[PDB]
Amino acid sequence: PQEVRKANIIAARSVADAIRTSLGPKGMDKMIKTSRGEIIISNDGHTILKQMAILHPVARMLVEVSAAQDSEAGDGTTSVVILTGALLGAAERLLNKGIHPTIIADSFQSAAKRSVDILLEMCHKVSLSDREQLVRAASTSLSSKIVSQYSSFLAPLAVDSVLKISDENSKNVDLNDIRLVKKVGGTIDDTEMIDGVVLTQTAIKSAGGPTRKEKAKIGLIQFQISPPEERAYLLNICKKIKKAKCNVLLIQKSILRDAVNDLALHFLSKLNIMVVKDIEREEIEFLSKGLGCKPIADIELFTEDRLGSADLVEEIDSDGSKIVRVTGIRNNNARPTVSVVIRGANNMIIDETERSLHDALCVIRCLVKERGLIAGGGAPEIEISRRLSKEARSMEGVQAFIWQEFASALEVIPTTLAENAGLNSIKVVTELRSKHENGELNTYEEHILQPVLVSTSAITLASECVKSILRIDDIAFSR
Amino acid sequence: EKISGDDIRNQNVLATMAVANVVKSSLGPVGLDKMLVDDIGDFTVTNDGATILSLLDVQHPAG
Amino acid sequence: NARLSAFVGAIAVGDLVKSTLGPKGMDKLLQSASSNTCMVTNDGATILKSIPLDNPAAKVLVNISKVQDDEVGDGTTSVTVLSAELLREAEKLIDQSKIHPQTIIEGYRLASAAALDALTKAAVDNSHDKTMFREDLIHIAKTTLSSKILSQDKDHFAELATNAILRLKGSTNLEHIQIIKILGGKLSDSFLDEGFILAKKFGNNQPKRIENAKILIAFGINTFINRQLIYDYPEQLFTDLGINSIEHADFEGVERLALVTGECDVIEEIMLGEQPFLKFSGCKAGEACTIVLRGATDQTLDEAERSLHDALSVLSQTTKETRTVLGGGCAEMVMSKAVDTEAQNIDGKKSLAVEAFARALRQLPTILADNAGFDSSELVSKLRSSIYNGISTSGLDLNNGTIADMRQLGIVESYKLKRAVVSSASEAAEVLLRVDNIIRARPR
Amino acid sequence: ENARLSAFVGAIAVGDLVKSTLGPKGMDKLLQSASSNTCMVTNDGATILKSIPLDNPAAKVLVNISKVQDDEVGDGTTSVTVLSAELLREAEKLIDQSKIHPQTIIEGYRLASAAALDALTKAAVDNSHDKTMFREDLIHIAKTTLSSKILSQDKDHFAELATNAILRLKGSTNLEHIQIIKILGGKLSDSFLDEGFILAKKFGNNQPKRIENAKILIANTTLDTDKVKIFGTKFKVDSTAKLAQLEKAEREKMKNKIAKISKFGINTFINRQLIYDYPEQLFTDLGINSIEHADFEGVERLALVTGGEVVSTFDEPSKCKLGECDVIEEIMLGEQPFLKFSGCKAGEACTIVLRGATDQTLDEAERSLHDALSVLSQTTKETRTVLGGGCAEMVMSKAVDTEAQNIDGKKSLAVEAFARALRQLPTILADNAGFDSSELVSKLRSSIYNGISTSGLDLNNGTIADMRQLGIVESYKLKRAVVSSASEAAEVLLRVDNIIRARPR
Amino acid sequence: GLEAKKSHILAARSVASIIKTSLGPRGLDKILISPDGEITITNDGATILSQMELDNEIAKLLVQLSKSQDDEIGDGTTGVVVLASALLDQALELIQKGIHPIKIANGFDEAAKLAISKLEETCDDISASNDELFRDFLLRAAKTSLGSKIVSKDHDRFAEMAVEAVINVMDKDRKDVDFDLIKMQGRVGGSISDSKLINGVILDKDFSHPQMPKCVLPKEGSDGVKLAILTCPFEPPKPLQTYEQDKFKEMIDDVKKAGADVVICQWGFDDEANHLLLQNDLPAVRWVGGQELEHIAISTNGRIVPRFQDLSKDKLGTCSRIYEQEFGTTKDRMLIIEQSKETKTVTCFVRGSNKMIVDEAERALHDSLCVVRNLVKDSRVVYGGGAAEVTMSLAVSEEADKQRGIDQYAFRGFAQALDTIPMTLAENSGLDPIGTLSTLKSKQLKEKISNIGVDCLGYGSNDMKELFVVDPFIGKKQQILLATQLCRMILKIDNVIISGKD
């Protein structure tokens, strides 16, 4: 049964070694040409593994590991693939010695739990009450992005956004509740928090639309205003909405029929009922959470108890933007959320700006689950191997040899960082271990910092990945 | 198919070299022109190197 | 040609699930033509039903595994592997051992009686000190939850399944325990509730809390239950009359209500997992419980459903039969001694047939030590020497790697579960030994 | 892997050639040559193996092993190859299911072979009954050997000494139990027989001439004048007296070993070299008797008759195997000091003291005596038989199963598989005779398993019958010769991990 | 520079992997077939490697080194080759990481020197413990090599033969044992219990005519026994019976004036030559090899006489006596030449009932005589059998963190390469190599620093210090030096050039 595992390890090692060249900003970029003729270029490990269309069944698990890497930690999608292949490469000599993969798999889970406590003792203890390190963490992370001078004002906006939803014991917080709406026009210097909610579209541009209303109710309605005499059919639709005093109508976007008839615009103009159409399907679940409302399919299902409250609903005047904002949801059951509007002249600005804020919110969220940060650049990978050197002598049996090979696989990550930078691989690693007798974590003066959750999740996900790889002893066709 | 290592690196250099060697004759006002034939069989005669690269059909990511 | 295809074809069936046996076992992966349906699971019933087989003799073990899954739901892998080991040794019993095939059948019949007598003499139950009997249910629940993701929190899940069965005190029917699976939260957040949590609400707009309600399945009733939907106008008319109507009641929900109630003291509506729930209170001698498991993803819940249903099905049978035996390779080792004991007086042609059954009993713990990373021939032989003459207590340990007592480590098994495995597996092997030829009619 | 396959499948294919020829009812085989007109048919197992050319380098080893049985005895050569081939069939099942070095399994065969030889001894019978007729024939043959030898002067006295030196042994017939003392200035007719082990060159000066309840310890050390050659070693000393002081410090550490001698509870110590007066003086206060000039031969012959062992080092106090003798008497005969031992535990031995007129008559009398005792003692292991008919083959099978009770973890399958090879002999005999091997052997093992089983293989009626009533017996010498040869044959093949292909001719 | 570094590691690994299973007393034997058709089976790695004829350029270095190991030590045959392959396997992982090959060569040289100083502190003294305990090591030295053979029953007899032989041929000044001064001779037949120790050359002879006496008379209290060594044949002068007889009377006068009892020549003799030598009680010896004459002058303190006119009484070899002693049942009836004084050379007499037993006993005695030389040359010794390699591993690995730079990884790879021998002994003993290696390291740290090795042959327990199992330190030190010397020469050659066969 070893021929099935050895074939999967070698096939997965070639994938990990291929992504290994993409580690770091100076790493080698990989090209993938789709059958349709599209060619993409980037160093992202999650994008390469997704568009590669790997036919190997076990190698497809790296996509799920890279997906959870960006969803939990938010960084290290390339490093988790390298660490996964490092354990697979070290497991090749383990099988040659006659070791069953169960001991190999059970030792990685025990070594991953002990590696967390080693990093926590060497990590710097920080708290969320201090905003000095929270602003500098997100500001230096944007040095790899187009934003440079405007990144100074973007850091405190992301800090105050997380501190409201972080609380204390909440631990993990869903990132889908943070919506970044990009729109052409404006600039980066203009930002509005708008903690109530922010939509993705504009308002009615036709004649008669108020486009602004004060003290209105907001609710989700899946109905649509359409003809089947036609004004009498549309009058009963607007009359039932007036019964619950709902001045804000949100209609789900559908290409089947229209949203609101022009005849109904004159009816709602006298009642001062604002209408916002073209609501995307992705925002249906979003608006049902922060606003605390419920999707309403029919007109009979529409009730007053499912309607929220809005202080002032207005359409902000801006060049090529016209963004509508809502403040003061006034809902005790529904917790508030953060929706930030992104503006810029070029389309390439608001695009990368949204992705740049994603990595900034993840690193800050890493401090919410587990506080503290570890300086990157190969420091946590080498520090663990330094502690496991003397600990390997305290073990007994087959596992004693695994601790030595586990620390050897951790050296692959700092070695790749030296290779992609043009410096000598071994020479740089020896200089770091030479000064380890004096310095410990010292990169601190270079304003380069990394959260502890990235280094913790990379070891945990890679330990379970390789554990599940050795569990497949056969490949069968079942349809 | 997947090709890595120095084998694909040499093919990328020879591919750009083949494309470069075609346009080296049109460099400068004293240079020589060329004819670009399509699948229909027609062609054109021009000394401008900017219009040549636009009408030249080459399948290659670096091309 | 048929005997060679039936023997080898059945071993290939056991070679698929050989890694799914034991808590240290491994997961098997399957891939269809669409390649997007691949799922990683260790369930033996899922592997056998999903994989198509053109061998007609292999289809017999598939239907037999379905009967074993309906009685308990676990141990289906051990039945297939044990049936495959009897056929693997039968190849040596026929060719080179000069044994009649019917003699092999009669050999397992006399050997099955010795295996059942070994489990009877080793079955010890304690009627007094129910606290000791409760601990036995905890150790049995740990073996049922093994091989599944729930093994992480199984230490906390041990008291969940044990205390749940103690709240029944009645028929073994599993319709009293309703399983509800809600996303979010860790697995350790699951709790035991006797209030009969309902996944559906009642009425359009009606009061949540109801006191002194009268449950009527369909008068002066405060609660109405209907199987079909409800029209708009009477739903509003029922509110003015003070009658609360319940909708979307399936056939499974009606059978659970008949085992509880009618009238109830308090009906409280709670919000968990973003969905209205109904927790009843103040029933009349409620025998029903509700276990709400909190998983991370739908894939974790789908595997936890049948994992908990199979664990409670074995604990439900422990109420009728209180006798327990020591597992973890110890149960198969004790039965191996009774086979060689009755081999002292035996006929000529039946001797090698019954002695082959003794080695087949040690093949099940042999695979258990394979997936555990240890050496099977080294560890089992050291235990066999101690069990050989007297002093039989300890059994195979899958963690430390030494010989330790199963009673001290908390590893025990039910007597009713083992007698069903030795039975069904013996009857499954006798069918395939009889067939020397297979004739299929011309299909249309 | 092909090295073991050539040593197993290659050997089994050659072993199965003579396997069907075992027994008078066994099969036959034709040996064909290139010209095909020179061929022949024979049932001999040794002829078929040697005539067939074998390019297998592992099969050539089995041919040289089978030649040992022909030169040592020459009977049952086919049974040795068949039994050795069955050991490879069980060893192949132990290896392929393990893939560990067979040397560990080889150690299990040695422990199992010891239990097989002990089971054959308890059930062994003999034709030695009515020894009165055997004693009259032993004295007549002994006088025949004395012809042409100087011992022919008196036949009656010398043949009587050899008669009482054999029948009175009741044990091993090896010449190491018979001590020969040769002295000068005496007559051959004055020779006498003594049951005690006799030395010469009496030990000690002030030591007593009588020792009661003596214990025997074997050790090798030099307590007198250590550091034999001091030449060449650099000596830096202020005075000459420091050189002799260094030897005293080296001998001072020997006091701990002398103290361990007293801890053994022994009253007598034996050493090959000499002993200085100071460690000898301490032997008097501790009650230790110092015996010197024990050489080597006389040590081995004394340790076997007294039930002791020989060791040159001390591993740990109060752990050893010691012999004992009740009375030690110091006498003098032939103008030479002699020693006399008596009262040994289970002591079986004798001493023949011959008095010659010169050195030529002494050497010729001892060599001619060993040739006469070898022929007479040859009949002790001859004609002695055991119960046959597959019984003794199954008795060795159940004896190994007794060893399978207390056994190590890795040696459990190695020893148990040895009993399976012993049960392959009745399986082969049942197939060659035309009977059912599965029915007969299974019913034969069930009866012999526990108690009161005289049954055996009966080929006339095709069933299990009592061999004692039919009078079916086989020689005990053939039993030990085949098992010992097959045990050594399996060692030669298993100890070879890799087999290089032989040069084709 | 590309495929050479990868091929040299795999070529030397496959050749060294042959004798890995034969290491130790439990190591399995092999079947060797000579080109003449003789089948030999032995566990000695020197016999297996010497019989290998191959064109592989890398594997030829194993044969060139093995020839010098038999003379210097003799026990470094299998152990060094396995240890040398361990340094090559660890160097292969460094080449893939970009480590320079000469740095690997110089890294193992500096690491070997540091491990020697560590064992110098933990070694123990023999003669300082006791004088008789030293002889107990010599008695049990040959018992270890002979314990795996039938010879182990009579092993007590062969232990005393090696003690008295080395003392005579070796002086405590230089402490050197020359192989040329030890004559190894054996024949087929007899038993192993009749082997005797002779202080001089044997020189088997039938004494020509049977009337000549089998013993040499003292000749009226003369000093020793004078023998004549002639490098020229005995023939009448040429560029008839009475002519040659009269010429023989002039040449025999040189023997009578010098007083030589026995005459030894390199060439045959005539019939009338033995007639004059018979009445004078002068036994004739003919057909003597050239190398046999060298052992005669060294043992008897004689000289080489080139011609007949140079024969003198001072150049005559002196011995105690020459007699013919029958050995067992063999009809050859060899002779014994004794001395009674300490000589500079000895001759080993070994017999056996089988041709293989004789050859296996002569080679086992060769390694036993070399251990005695190392025990006298170096009193400090260490406990082997797996305990020495683990001690060297923990010593280099501990000093690896203290030495920074590139040599930090060179010390780690050198420490892991030293773990191959105890794991190989653990594999050759039928035990878990990884599980046993962790046990030996745990007992030498948490408890106390001591020597506990892996048991190849079944013993009572661990801690061979209790069983008094000793190995020479300078013998083990010579093995680790030849291993690093061989590992460099393999790395120092990156080129492979071979021509065709015409």
mmCIF file of all heavy atoms in Angstrom, chain D residues 101 104 220 222 229 231-232 250 254 296 495-497, chain E residues 21 26 29-30 127 130-132 135 170-171 342 427:
data_model
loop_
_atom_site.group_PDB
_atom_site.id
_atom_site.type_symbol
_atom_site.label_atom_id
_atom_site.label_comp_id
_atom_site.label_asym_id
_atom_site.label_seq_id
_atom_site.Cartn_x
_atom_site.Cartn_y
_atom_site.Cartn_z
ATOM 1 N N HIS D 101 16.067 -10.546 10.006
ATOM 2 C CA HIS D 101 17.207 -11.442 9.879
ATOM 3 C C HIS D 101 16.891 -12.798 10.512
ATOM 4 O O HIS D 101 16.470 -12.850 11.677
ATOM 5 C CB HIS D 101 18.443 -10.827 10.535
ATOM 6 C CG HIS D 101 18.867 -9.530 9.921
ATOM 7 N ND1 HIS D 101 19.418 -9.448 8.660
ATOM 8 C CD2 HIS D 101 18.815 -8.262 10.392
ATOM 9 C CE1 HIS D 101 19.692 -8.186 8.383
ATOM 10 N NE2 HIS D 101 19.336 -7.445 9.417
ATOM 11 N N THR D 104 17.833 -14.575 14.368
ATOM 12 C CA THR D 104 16.983 -14.624 15.554
ATOM 13 C C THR D 104 16.100 -15.866 15.541
ATOM 14 O O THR D 104 15.911 -16.514 16.577
ATOM 15 C CB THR D 104 16.128 -13.359 15.644
ATOM 16 O OG1 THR D 104 16.979 -12.210 15.737
ATOM 17 C CG2 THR D 104 15.221 -13.407 16.864
ATOM 18 N N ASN D 220 41.512 -19.073 36.015
ATOM 19 C CA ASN D 220 42.839 -18.915 35.427
ATOM 20 C C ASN D 220 43.381 -17.551 35.833
ATOM 21 O O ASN D 220 42.844 -16.517 35.419
ATOM 22 C CB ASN D 220 42.784 -19.056 33.903
ATOM 23 C CG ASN D 220 44.163 -19.123 33.264
ATOM 24 O OD1 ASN D 220 45.162 -18.715 33.857
ATOM 25 N ND2 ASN D 220 44.218 -19.642 32.043
ATOM 26 N N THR D 222 47.364 -15.616 37.497
ATOM 27 C CA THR D 222 48.747 -15.739 37.946
ATOM 28 C C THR D 222 48.917 -14.903 39.208
ATOM 29 O O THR D 222 48.911 -13.669 39.148
ATOM 30 C CB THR D 222 49.720 -15.291 36.857
ATOM 31 O OG1 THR D 222 49.551 -16.114 35.696
ATOM 32 C CG2 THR D 222 51.154 -15.406 37.346
ATOM 33 N N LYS D 229 57.285 -10.032 31.232
ATOM 34 C CA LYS D 229 58.311 -9.319 30.478
ATOM 35 C C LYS D 229 58.211 -7.832 30.797
ATOM 36 O O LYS D 229 57.263 -7.163 30.371
ATOM 37 C CB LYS D 229 58.160 -9.571 28.979
ATOM 38 C CG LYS D 229 59.233 -8.911 28.128
ATOM 39 C CD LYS D 229 59.047 -9.235 26.655
ATOM 40 C CE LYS D 229 60.106 -8.554 25.803
ATOM 41 N NZ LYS D 229 59.938 -8.863 24.356
ATOM 42 N N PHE D 231 60.890 -5.863 30.016
ATOM 43 C CA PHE D 231 61.885 -5.247 29.148
ATOM 44 C C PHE D 231 61.204 -4.424 28.062
ATOM 45 O O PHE D 231 60.255 -4.885 27.422
ATOM 46 C CB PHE D 231 62.778 -6.318 28.522
ATOM 47 C CG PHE D 231 63.795 -5.774 27.560
ATOM 48 C CD1 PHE D 231 64.970 -5.204 28.023
ATOM 49 C CD2 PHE D 231 63.582 -5.840 26.193
ATOM 50 C CE1 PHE D 231 65.910 -4.704 27.141
ATOM 51 C CE2 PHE D 231 64.518 -5.342 25.305
ATOM 52 C CZ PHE D 231 65.683 -4.773 25.780
ATOM 53 N N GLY D 232 61.698 -3.204 27.852
ATOM 54 C CA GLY D 232 61.183 -2.308 26.844
ATOM 55 C C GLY D 232 60.291 -1.203 27.372
ATOM 56 O O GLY D 232 60.122 -0.185 26.690
ATOM 57 N N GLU D 250 49.773 -4.226 42.162
ATOM 58 C CA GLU D 250 48.976 -4.954 41.182
ATOM 59 C C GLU D 250 48.370 -6.212 41.792
ATOM 60 O O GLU D 250 47.209 -6.543 41.524
ATOM 61 C CB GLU D 250 49.832 -5.305 39.965
ATOM 62 C CG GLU D 250 50.337 -4.099 39.188
ATOM 63 C CD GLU D 250 49.214 -3.222 38.673
ATOM 64 O OE1 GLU D 250 48.180 -3.769 38.236
ATOM 65 O OE2 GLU D 250 49.365 -1.982 38.705
ATOM 66 N N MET D 254 44.172 -8.062 43.526
ATOM 67 C CA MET D 254 43.712 -9.443 43.466
ATOM 68 C C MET D 254 43.071 -9.906 44.767
ATOM 69 O O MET D 254 42.413 -10.952 44.771
ATOM 70 C CB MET D 254 44.877 -10.368 43.109
ATOM 71 C CG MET D 254 45.436 -10.155 41.714
ATOM 72 S SD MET D 254 44.200 -10.427 40.430
ATOM 73 C CE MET D 254 43.887 -12.178 40.638
ATOM 74 N N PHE D 296 44.854 -28.128 31.189
ATOM 75 C CA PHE D 296 43.582 -27.851 30.532
ATOM 76 C C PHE D 296 42.770 -29.133 30.371
ATOM 77 O O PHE D 296 41.625 -29.197 30.829
ATOM 78 C CB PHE D 296 43.799 -27.110 29.201
ATOM 79 C CG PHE D 296 44.686 -27.823 28.214
ATOM 80 C CD1 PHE D 296 44.142 -28.594 27.198
ATOM 81 C CD2 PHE D 296 46.065 -27.708 28.295
ATOM 82 C CE1 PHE D 296 44.957 -29.236 26.284
ATOM 83 C CE2 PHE D 296 46.885 -28.355 27.388
ATOM 84 C CZ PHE D 296 46.330 -29.121 26.382
ATOM 85 N N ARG D 495 21.865 -18.494 7.530
ATOM 86 C CA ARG D 495 22.900 -17.521 7.863
ATOM 87 C C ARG D 495 23.451 -16.792 6.645
ATOM 88 O O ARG D 495 24.236 -15.854 6.816
ATOM 89 C CB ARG D 495 24.050 -18.197 8.613
ATOM 90 C CG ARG D 495 23.704 -18.633 10.028
ATOM 91 C CD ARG D 495 24.845 -19.419 10.653
ATOM 92 N NE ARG D 495 25.105 -20.665 9.939
ATOM 93 C CZ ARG D 495 26.051 -21.535 10.274
ATOM 94 N NH1 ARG D 495 26.833 -21.298 11.318
ATOM 95 N NH2 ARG D 495 26.216 -22.643 9.565
ATOM 96 N N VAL D 496 23.082 -17.194 5.435
ATOM 97 C CA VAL D 496 23.543 -16.543 4.215
ATOM 98 C C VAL D 496 22.444 -15.600 3.742
ATOM 99 O O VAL D 496 21.369 -16.043 3.323
ATOM 100 C CB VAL D 496 23.910 -17.562 3.130
ATOM 101 C CG1 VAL D 496 24.298 -16.846 1.851
ATOM 102 C CG2 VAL D 496 25.039 -18.461 3.608
ATOM 103 N N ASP D 497 22.710 -14.293 3.810
ATOM 104 C CA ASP D 497 21.727 -13.307 3.374
ATOM 105 C C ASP D 497 21.729 -13.129 1.859
ATOM 106 O O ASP D 497 20.661 -13.046 1.242
ATOM 107 C CB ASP D 497 21.982 -11.969 4.071
ATOM 108 C CG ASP D 497 23.377 -11.428 3.814
ATOM 109 O OD1 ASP D 497 24.199 -12.148 3.210
ATOM 110 O OD2 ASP D 497 23.653 -10.280 4.219
ATOM 111 N N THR E 21 24.752 -5.825 6.371
ATOM 112 C CA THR E 21 24.074 -6.896 7.088
ATOM 113 C C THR E 21 25.038 -7.892 7.720
ATOM 114 O O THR E 21 24.614 -8.682 8.571
ATOM 115 C CB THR E 21 23.119 -7.638 6.149
ATOM 116 O OG1 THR E 21 23.856 -8.178 5.045
ATOM 117 C CG2 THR E 21 22.049 -6.694 5.624
ATOM 118 N N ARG E 26 26.500 -11.270 14.934
ATOM 119 C CA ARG E 26 25.240 -11.771 14.405
ATOM 120 C C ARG E 26 25.105 -11.521 12.905
ATOM 121 O O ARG E 26 24.164 -12.031 12.287
ATOM 122 C CB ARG E 26 24.072 -11.132 15.170
ATOM 123 C CG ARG E 26 22.690 -11.671 14.819
ATOM 124 C CD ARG E 26 21.586 -11.012 15.625
ATOM 125 N NE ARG E 26 20.272 -11.529 15.252
ATOM 126 C CZ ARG E 26 19.543 -11.058 14.245
ATOM 127 N NH1 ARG E 26 19.998 -10.057 13.507
ATOM 128 N NH2 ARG E 26 18.359 -11.587 13.972
ATOM 129 N N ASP E 29 26.191 -14.512 7.027
ATOM 130 C CA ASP E 29 27.283 -14.918 6.157
ATOM 131 C C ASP E 29 26.898 -14.720 4.693
ATOM 132 O O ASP E 29 25.801 -14.261 4.363
ATOM 133 C CB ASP E 29 27.659 -16.373 6.427
ATOM 134 C CG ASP E 29 28.274 -16.574 7.797
ATOM 135 O OD1 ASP E 29 28.677 -15.572 8.422
ATOM 136 O OD2 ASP E 29 28.356 -17.736 8.249
ATOM 137 N N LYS E 30 27.821 -15.071 3.798
ATOM 138 C CA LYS E 30 27.587 -14.997 2.362
ATOM 139 C C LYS E 30 28.277 -16.172 1.685
ATOM 140 O O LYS E 30 29.221 -16.757 2.220
ATOM 141 C CB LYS E 30 28.092 -13.674 1.767
ATOM 142 C CG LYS E 30 27.339 -12.446 2.246
ATOM 143 C CD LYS E 30 27.866 -11.178 1.605
ATOM 144 C CE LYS E 30 27.133 -9.961 2.139
ATOM 145 N NZ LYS E 30 25.680 -10.000 1.821
ATOM 146 N N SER E 127 45.897 -1.649 32.892
ATOM 147 C CA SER E 127 46.961 -2.034 33.814
ATOM 148 C C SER E 127 46.837 -1.328 35.158
ATOM 149 O O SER E 127 47.283 -1.860 36.181
ATOM 150 C CB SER E 127 48.326 -1.747 33.187
ATOM 151 O OG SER E 127 48.500 -0.358 32.965
ATOM 152 N N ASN E 130 44.417 -3.592 37.344
ATOM 153 C CA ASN E 130 45.072 -4.807 37.818
ATOM 154 C C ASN E 130 45.912 -5.351 36.671
ATOM 155 O O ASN E 130 45.686 -5.019 35.504
ATOM 156 C CB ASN E 130 44.056 -5.862 38.285
ATOM 157 C CG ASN E 130 44.705 -7.033 39.006
ATOM 158 O OD1 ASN E 130 45.903 -7.283 38.871
ATOM 159 N ND2 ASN E 130 43.907 -7.760 39.780
ATOM 160 N N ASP E 131 46.888 -6.193 37.020
ATOM 161 C CA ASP E 131 47.719 -6.828 36.003
ATOM 162 C C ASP E 131 47.036 -8.051 35.402
ATOM 163 O O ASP E 131 47.086 -8.257 34.185
ATOM 164 C CB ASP E 131 49.073 -7.214 36.595
ATOM 165 C CG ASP E 131 49.997 -7.844 35.571
ATOM 166 O OD1 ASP E 131 50.425 -7.131 34.638
ATOM 167 O OD2 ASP E 131 50.289 -9.051 35.694
ATOM 168 N N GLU E 132 46.398 -8.872 36.240
ATOM 169 C CA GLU E 132 45.761 -10.089 35.751
ATOM 170 C C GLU E 132 44.484 -9.803 34.974
ATOM 171 O O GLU E 132 44.070 -10.637 34.160
ATOM 172 C CB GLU E 132 45.465 -11.033 36.917
ATOM 173 C CG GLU E 132 46.711 -11.546 37.617
ATOM 174 C CD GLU E 132 47.645 -12.282 36.677
ATOM 175 O OE1 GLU E 132 47.151 -13.045 35.819
ATOM 176 O OE2 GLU E 132 48.875 -12.093 36.790
ATOM 177 N N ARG E 135 45.383 -9.778 31.281
ATOM 178 C CA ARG E 135 45.416 -11.095 30.656
ATOM 179 C C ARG E 135 44.012 -11.641 30.428
ATOM 180 O O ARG E 135 43.776 -12.347 29.442
ATOM 181 C CB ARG E 135 46.233 -12.065 31.511
ATOM 182 C CG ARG E 135 46.336 -13.468 30.935
ATOM 183 C CD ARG E 135 47.126 -14.392 31.848
ATOM 184 N NE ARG E 135 48.527 -13.996 31.945
ATOM 185 C CZ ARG E 135 49.423 -14.605 32.717
ATOM 186 N NH1 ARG E 135 49.063 -15.644 33.457
ATOM 187 N NH2 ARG E 135 50.678 -14.179 32.744
ATOM 188 N N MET E 170 57.106 -9.254 20.113
ATOM 189 C CA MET E 170 56.951 -7.821 20.316
ATOM 190 C C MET E 170 57.685 -7.402 21.580
ATOM 191 O O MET E 170 57.549 -8.045 22.626
ATOM 192 C CB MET E 170 55.474 -7.429 20.414
ATOM 193 C CG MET E 170 55.247 -5.954 20.705
ATOM 194 S SD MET E 170 53.505 -5.505 20.810
ATOM 195 C CE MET E 170 53.057 -6.268 22.366
ATOM 196 N N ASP E 171 58.459 -6.325 21.480
ATOM 197 C CA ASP E 171 59.134 -5.732 22.622
ATOM 198 C C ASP E 171 58.378 -4.490 23.077
ATOM 199 O O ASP E 171 57.805 -3.758 22.267
ATOM 200 C CB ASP E 171 60.580 -5.369 22.279
ATOM 201 C CG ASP E 171 61.457 -6.590 22.085
ATOM 202 O OD1 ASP E 171 61.046 -7.692 22.508
ATOM 203 O OD2 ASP E 171 62.557 -6.449 21.511
ATOM 204 N N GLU E 342 63.652 -16.822 24.165
ATOM 205 C CA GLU E 342 62.776 -15.868 23.495
ATOM 206 C C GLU E 342 63.355 -15.498 22.134
ATOM 207 O O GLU E 342 64.500 -15.045 22.040
ATOM 208 C CB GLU E 342 62.594 -14.624 24.359
ATOM 209 C CG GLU E 342 61.643 -13.594 23.772
ATOM 210 C CD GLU E 342 61.451 -12.394 24.679
ATOM 211 O OE1 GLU E 342 62.091 -12.350 25.752
ATOM 212 O OE2 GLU E 342 60.661 -11.496 24.320
ATOM 213 N N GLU E 427 19.998 -2.828 13.663
ATOM 214 C CA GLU E 427 19.327 -3.543 12.584
ATOM 215 C C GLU E 427 19.869 -4.959 12.444
ATOM 216 O O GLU E 427 19.103 -5.907 12.238
ATOM 217 C CB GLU E 427 19.475 -2.782 11.266
ATOM 218 C CG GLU E 427 18.721 -1.464 11.215
ATOM 219 C CD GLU E 427 18.948 -0.712 9.917
ATOM 220 O OE1 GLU E 427 19.834 -1.122 9.139
ATOM 221 O OE2 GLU E 427 18.238 0.287 9.675
#
